[PDB]
């Protein structure tokens, strides 16, 4: 199947028509997405099959064909870009200054951008084009807006 680096839509034909359930990143021969998008299921790419290789429900991440390859991190100061891939819509870069998720185990970057549920797995990038994490696991704050963690393996 298609193994060229890039951003991809995760689709299913089990529901009505073709529905986009999420997004992922192909890099160095490994496909990276969020666990809640595929639930660890195998994926089809053309005539080929991608099998899960590593996953963890608590991190909400899964990799296929090999181990997690994305190791860039937000520097805590600079603006980033959400390369949003919404259902039925073209990939679009949105620039933002991340906020912070303060946890008992440390801090995590957060992006306050609202997109449909099937945009989960869209990569967040630094100025150099490196994926610093995936968008799609976060919280709904006081006045119904969405804030996603910058989730990295």
């Amino acid at each position: 199947g298609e193994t060229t680096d890039g951003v991809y839509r995760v689709m299913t034909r089990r529901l009505l028509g073709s529905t986009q359930v999420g997004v992922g990143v192909m890099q160095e021969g490994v496909f990276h997405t969020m666990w809640h998008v595929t639930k660890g299921a195998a994926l089809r790419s053309g005539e080929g099959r991608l099998d899960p290789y590593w996953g963890d429900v608590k991190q909400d991440l899964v990799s296929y064909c090999g181990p997690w390859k994305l190791d860039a991190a937000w520097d805590g100061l600079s603006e980033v870009q959400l390369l949003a891939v919404p259902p039925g819509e073209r990939a679009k870069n949105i620039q933002t200054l991340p906020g912070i998720f303060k946890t008992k185990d440390g801090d995590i970057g957060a992006v306050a951008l609202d997109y449909p549920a099937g945009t989960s797995g869209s990569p967040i990038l630094d100025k150099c084009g490196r994926v610093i994490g995936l968008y799609g696991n976060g919280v709904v704050i006081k006045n119904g807006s969405y804030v996603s963690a910058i989730t990295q393996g």
Binding site: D5, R14, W35, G99, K102, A110, D126
Partner: protein, 39 residues
Amino acid sequence: DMYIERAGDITWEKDAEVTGNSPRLDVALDESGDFSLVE
């Protein structure tokens, strides 16, 4: 069975639309991978 479709290159876009705020929120992460607001 789920399938993947290419959607684009991963590149920084010079002069992209800049939006969104930077909130600082206290959160908890449970065993199910769900984030919640600590109050």
